[PDB]
Amino acid sequence: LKGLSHLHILNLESNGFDEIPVEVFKDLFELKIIDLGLNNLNTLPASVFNNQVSLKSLNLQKNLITSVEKKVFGPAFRNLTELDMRFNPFDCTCESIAWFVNWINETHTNIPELSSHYLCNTPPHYHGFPVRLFDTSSC
RNA sequence: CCCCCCCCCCCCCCCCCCCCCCCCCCCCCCCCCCCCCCCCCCCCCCCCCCCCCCCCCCCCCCCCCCCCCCCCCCCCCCCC
């Protein structure tokens, strides 16, 4: 993907990806839509979406993602229009989704089916509970 | 100067088997859209038929009144 300065739409859905190299998206400054759903992604390297300063739509549904952290999704979640991370095994813990749930609480990005398909998986106390109802007052 | 036999390690290639990953096809279930047919409920429309009510018309019947015509009967007076 190097040198594709004018790339706008990238679709990499359902390729079986387990890990993403940190510097695969570094040249894609004008990228607006990236689709990475239906892969096997769980852990992402930090600063992998740093150069995506014009990203408007991120799709990561039906992956194995458990934690959404600022060091990875910070620049990606800056100015979005649509977010799609629905069917993921979210780990509802203060070090996994606390920044993400705070971001969900105040944001203008459209997140469809937020109250139904964003469900905790672990710990068993939270299994099945909505991610948006996680309480961060004791973090 | 010259062959053969063992040892370790590195390989190459052809098969077998097991793994993840993906594609295509199919099956099961569910959902959505469309089409067709059918049932149920309610509000109606038009037409036909039957019945009833009101009003009116025409005809007829019964009774009564008026006029005209006709007939009978009673008083009274003259003419020859």
Contact by Cβ (8 Å): A70, A95: no
What are the φ and ψ backbone dihedral angles of A56, each rounded to 5 degrees?
Answer: -120, -15
- A73-112: string of b/e by CB count within 10 Å (b at 16+)? bebbbeebeebbbbebebbbbeebbbbbbebbeeeebebe
Straight-line distance from CA A36 to C1' B25, in Å?
A: 25
- Reported resolution in A? 2.3
Straight-line distance from CA A115 to C1' B30, in Å?
A: 22
CA A119, CA A66: separation in Å to the nearest integer? Answer: 11
Contact by Cβ (8 Å): A136, A126: no
Contact by Cβ (8 Å): A22, A43: no
Contact by Cβ (8 Å): A86, A62: yes
Q: Solved by what technique?
A: cryo-EM
Straight-line distance from CA A53 to C1' B48, in Å?
A: 81
Residue A124's identity, in one-letter code, is P
Across-strand partners of A71?
Answer: none
Across-strand partners of A110?
Answer: A82
